[PDB]
Structure formats: C-alpha cells, structure tokens
Amino acid sequence: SGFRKMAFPSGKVEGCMVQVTCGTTTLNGLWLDDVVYCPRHVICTSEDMLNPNYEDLLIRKSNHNFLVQAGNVQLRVIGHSMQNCVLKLKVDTANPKTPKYKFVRIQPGQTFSVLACYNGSPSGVYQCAMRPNFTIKGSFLNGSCGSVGFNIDYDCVSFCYMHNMELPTGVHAGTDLEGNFYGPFVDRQTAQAAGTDTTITVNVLAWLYAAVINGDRWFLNRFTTTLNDFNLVAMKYNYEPLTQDHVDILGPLSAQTGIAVLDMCASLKELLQNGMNGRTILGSALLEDEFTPFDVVRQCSGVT
Amino acid sequence: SGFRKMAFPSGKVEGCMVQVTCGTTTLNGLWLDDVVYCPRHVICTSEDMLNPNYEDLLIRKSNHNFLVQAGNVQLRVIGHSMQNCVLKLKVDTANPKTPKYKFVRIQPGQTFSVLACYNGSPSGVYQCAMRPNFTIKGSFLNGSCGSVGFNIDYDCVSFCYMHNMELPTGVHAGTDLEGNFYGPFVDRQTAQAAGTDTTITVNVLAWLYAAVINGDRWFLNRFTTTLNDFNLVAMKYNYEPLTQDHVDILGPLSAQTGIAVLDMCASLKELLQNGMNGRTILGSALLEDEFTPFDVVRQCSGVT
Ligand SMILES: *[C@H](O)[C@H](C[C@@H]1CCNC1=O)NC(=O)[C@H](CC(C)C)NC(=O)OCc1ccccc1
Ligand SMILES: *[C@H](O)[C@H](C[C@@H]1CCNC1=O)NC(=O)[C@H](CC(C)C)NC(=O)OCc1ccccc1
Question: Which residues act catalytically here (chains A, B)?
Fold first, then answer.
C-alpha cells in the first residue's frame, strides 16, 4: 500500500548527460549516438539574452567554439546545426552508453521525470506534469538548462522535455528534443505570460481512485451527476472539461474499485464546493492533478 | 527557483539490484562485491511468516536453494549467513558495477531516496524521511522487500534502509544493511504498533526557510518567541522539541535569509495555532517535515 510522487529510475539518462560550454556560458547537453543536444541559448552572452538574433550569433561560432565534456573526457565537435531552439553538435564519438530512445512531443496532462543537472552532473530526479498551459512546476537554478524530462517504457527512454527558462510566476518552460517550445514561449529574457493554469480533471479523478485503492474513502458521497452538470462545476473552478475519452481512460480504475466515474465526479463536485473541512487525502490537503491514470495503475500493479 | 521533493539519481543503485528466489518466495537483493544482501524472510513460506523460527528455517536451506539472478545472469551462491534480519549470500562473482559505498544507520528526521524494485528490476525512485517513530511513508507492494534507501555523497552511495514490511496503519518498516530494524519491529506477520508519529520541527523550519527563499513570505509575522515558549506549543501539537543544535543546523538558512530562527519559530507557532486560512506554502496546504536543512541547501545551491 501507499501512494507517492514517483520518478522513473534515472540511470539510463545519467549516462547521456554532458557539459556544453560556449564562451563563458555552461549548460547540460544530451549525448545520444554521435549527436549532443542542448539549448541554442548556450551561444548567448548575458547581453545577447535580452533579444538575441540566434542566426547572426551562431554564424560567429564554429565547431571548435563548442567545448563538450563527458566526465573528464573532452569530445571533438565535427558539425553544428540549429533546429528551432535546440543546438545539435555532431561529435566524433558515439555515446557507448546510448539507451534505446525516442523523441516524443508529450500532451498537456501527461507526466514525466526530470533529471535536474548542473555542469553535466546529475543533482536529483522528480516527477512533473506538463500543465494545460504548457508550463511545469520544477526546481531549476542557473546552469540547469539542458536538463531533460523523459518516460521509460521497459527498455525505451522517451525524451519529451529540455529545460530552457523560468517565467516571472516562478514556473518553468522548455522545448521538445526537436527544439519546439511547449506553449507560446520564446528563448529571450523578456516577461512572458503562461495562460490561466487549469486543473487536469482526469488526473484528479485517477488520484481519488488511487486514494480509494489505499483506504481513503471518506469523500465518497451518496450522489451521482452527469458530464454537463459536472462540467458546469468544472468551468466554475478552472477544471478541464471531462469527456467520454477521459471516462474510457479511467475505465480500468472504475472497474478495479467498482465506483462509477460519474459518482467519483459527484464526490469531486462536493470536494470542490465544500473544500476538505481540514481533512487530507493520501496525505495532501489539496486536490492533486499531477498523477495520470497510467501513473496510478503502474504504481498500484508494480510495473518495472 | 522552485522547491520539489527530489530523489538522488538512482543509476549507481540500479546496477546493484538482483532477484533472490528461495522456494516460491521472490524479493530483491543488493549485490555489492561478492555478497548479495536481502531480507531473511525470503526463506519463509506464507505459513512460516506468522511466527517463523529463522534459525530452524535457515538450517533446511543450503547455497543451491538460493536462486540469485542479475538480469538474465544466474549467480553461483558459495556461502550463506544470517546477520540479524538480513541474509548475506556469498556469490562466486564480484559485481563489476559495485559503486563506492558505505552502510550507515541513519538518524530519525534524516531523509533518503527509495529505489522501489520488483523481481530485481527498478520501478521508480522517491524521497522518504525516517519518521521520529522509525517508520517511513512509502509505496510498496508484494515483491518490493529488498528495495533499498540510500544517500549519495558525490561518488559514495550510503545505503541506510532495506524494505521488510507494512504496518496495519499502512506505513512501512525495514532494517539497516546490518539487518537491524529501525524501531521496535520484528519480521513476523503479526499486528505491530509504531509509536505516536511526531512532526520533525527542525525540518518544518528548513521548509519555511525554503519557502521564504522561493518568495512565499505571507506567514512571516511581527512576533518572536523563546525555545521553552515555542516548545510548550510544540508539545501541544506533537512537534519534536527544538534545541540549540537544531538552531545551529538552521544557522546557514537563517544567515542566508536574514530571519532569526526564533522569529521563524513564532511564525510556525501562529501557523500551528491558526492553521493556514485556506492559503498554501510551496504548493502545500499542510506543514511539510520531510525536508532536512541539508535537503534545502543542496536543492538551493544546486549540489551534484
Ligand atoms: C538555464 O540554465 C536558465 C535556467 C533559469 C535560471 C534560473 N531558473 C531557470 O529556469 N535559463 C535562462 O537563464 C533563460 C535564458 C533565456 C535566453 C531564455 N532565461 C531566464 O530564464 O530568465 C528568467 C530568469 C533568469 C535568471 C534567474 C531567474 C529567472
Ligand atoms: C515484502 O515484499 C513484503 C512487503 C509488504 C507487502 C505489501 N506491502 C509491504 O510492505 N513484506 C511482507 O510481506 C512482510 C513479511 C513478514 C515476514 C515481515 N509481511 C507484511 O508486511 O505483512 C503486512 C502485509 C502483508 C501483505 C500485504 C499487506 C500488508
């Protein structure tokens, strides 16, 4: 029993982290086959960062201007190209620790593990959701850029995130491994707005299922509701509208617990309308939306 | 910016996990040099578990009765010994992936990362505190025993925990790597009581410091207090009494933020006496006690 914000084991990603230095700027790179991926803003001086012309800045750089270091080992750069907001440095050496991997553009509401790195060395690992407004609630200091978010599927590492910047609200923004930002953000040191941040309804429901499975049942009420009725209440509280697809995804959890999704919806509506009255669910005094239905079933069936 | 429940990178511990099978029972083992460590209750049948005589049960077992598997690789067992509640299986092969390591008996209030495993394969990683009552609030299913808790100090893995059992309250109990239980627990399937579970005051203070550092300052009040006065209020709310040692440990955080420990104590007293009035601190609606002062300074200075 017990339910915990659980990260993927980080060993296969640790083996891909390198240090990328261009002039004074140092951040983390991802070393897969003979290509090192990092944020293109490694080429910026603190001045460039206010409104950089990446095209013009990159032209003053050649392969020898990119210092790539794995442990104490200095890699030889034999090619450089800019793809959106990612720099790809061709190196003479294929990473002998390259896991089986894919690049995936993850959907809002899905989760992933962040391996927070500095100077190409791992610091720690934590689970994040891609929020509806394409930000994450991370822990990132200077030097953390190039740190990556990933899922593991048995042997296959799926990289989905590369850390780039912190917004004025203190939340975090980054790119997929093709260098395309999640959300409307650009890699320049200007004030940038994430949209209103809405709660991931299907994830809140999964976590209430997770709680029921763990013997927290107090919030279970005598009521039911419909999607429209519930969605009226969802809109009021900035919850994402629930859909039959969301119901279908919860099916396994519904069928395991024997609690109809719309009954759980009625429970959530009363939680949302009355608060928790100083009570807690799975050791939290707020409704948690950073667990997917998959996250719940993995942790509850002991997937490795 | 940002503050997250962060686990250590798990790569060095992943390389030490093996599968130990005795008869039908399978759990995880830790493979360091030519010794595999696992819970001695691997030798129990479901019947034995109610009141096992480990001495008599172990005597019916020889080296060939211990099936040790690393990946698809079957290790040869050339020796077995019981040390408290741990079985040490001597194997013919030294683990070529053995990290630099120590066995440490960790203090209550200190934190560690758990690499949750099944069949010797990693499932995920999360941070736990050893509670004052020598239990942890984990996520552990059947097969999870042998899963270990550890800290990393640069190159050195410090193993402190090996998972053994879940108590009726749904919290978790285990041994150090010498097989000595944390707390009054024994490895038998009987009802066992952890003591009253008290809050780790020094950790709550570190986290309020963590919050101030992250721009959450609302709870900062105009009051101060003394240790005795504060400790009167601590006893009332089942907080561990605060000591000059605890103050000295917070010194760095106090000196960084410019907020006296006793002023922060006065803030905590009002939080404890008035609750949070529906407000949140670092995205929590409860006072968090599973961050040590070290945890806060590591995450805030980007230690790797
Ligand atoms: C990459 O290492 C860095 C990560 C920032 C630093 C502090 N917390 C983060 O997430 N990214 C940047 O510095 C980024 C570079 C621009 C070219 C996009 N700029 C940025 O994030 O500005 C906001 C900020 C900078 C420094 C401290 C706090 C916030
Ligand atoms: C080790 O794999 C297992 C871990 C339990 C299983 C479910 N959650 C856990 O932490 N440990 C035991 O099964 C342990 C063996 C005794 C000889 C100590 N017994 C135990 O934990 O009893 C409580 C329990 C058993 C099964 C399910 C739920 C609770």
Answer: 41 (for 3cl-pro activity), 145 (nucleophile)
